[PDB]
Amino acid sequence: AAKKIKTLKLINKKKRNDLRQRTLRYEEEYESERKKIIELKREARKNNCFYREAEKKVVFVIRLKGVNKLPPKVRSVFRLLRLLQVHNGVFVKVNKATKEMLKIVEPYVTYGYPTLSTVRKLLYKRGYVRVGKVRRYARKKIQDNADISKHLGKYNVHGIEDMVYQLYTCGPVFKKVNNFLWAFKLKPPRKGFKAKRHAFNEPRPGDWGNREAHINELINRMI
């Protein structure tokens, strides 16, 4: 019938309004947290104490080596972290277990802590989705919000800013949001590397360590 159309057209409108409201709330949250951190330190200096900041909860990991000549335990961890070829990148939740998984493969990767605008750029410029029945997935670029809501809106995420929120802060829906995305495929950086052989913390030019907030600079060049 024709009435089949009007109800759907109304439901889409109400869903869009709700998404707008939630995005505004997210913006308020970002600003308020940013301003609270910036005065707690300023007050600590006055009262002769130190303010140790909360640690991170999220990393972004990039592979540095090819696929030949690797020990089996390294290959198992690469399979479990979904890094399959040279310049791929994924998000990882920070635990006591992932840290020990990560120490195994440290001389072959580089990683660190991402900001908000970096998450937004990764999601908008290089964001691809898995679409289909289970175990048949057909990588598709986003271009729209219906695919997100179809698979993942049961947990109240209908839109792209919702996934940004759940990734930049380890929200309750993080395993599903992260597992929903295809692994990122990145260009080589625009001014080259220094030396993949050596580490970031060695007194020489090198790469392979954990570089905490300097990962944003690198992934803006190899976006």
């Binding site: 995005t23 750029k121 986003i142 271009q143 729209d144």
Partner: protein, 86 residues
């Protein structure tokens, strides 16, 4: 469906607003607050100083004391070791 060209989701306004139903408001607010500032040049950059006198002079003593103490402790360790040498 047949696949088409993939549109740049950051520089194409129509798809950007399609994906983010709240981006138009934020961009408009930023543009308004950007124009307000330039329309008040030769009338801004003056109040900044008169309030910097208000609060930076209060912060200055605390900062100076902190760094003074750090340097003094670093000196104390040096003298204590040099005297220990003999």
């Amino acid at each position: 469906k047949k696949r088409l060209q993939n549109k740049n989701s950051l520089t194409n306004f129509a798809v950007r607003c399609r994906l983010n139903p709240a981006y138009k408001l934020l961009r408009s607010l930023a543009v308004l607050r950007m124009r307000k500032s330039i329309l008040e040049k030769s009338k801004n950059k003056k109040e900044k100083r008169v309030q910097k006198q208000i609060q930076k002079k209060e912060l200055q003593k605390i900062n100076h004391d902190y760094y003074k103490g750090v340097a003094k402790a670093v000196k104390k360790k040096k003298k204590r070791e040099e005297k220990k040498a003999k």
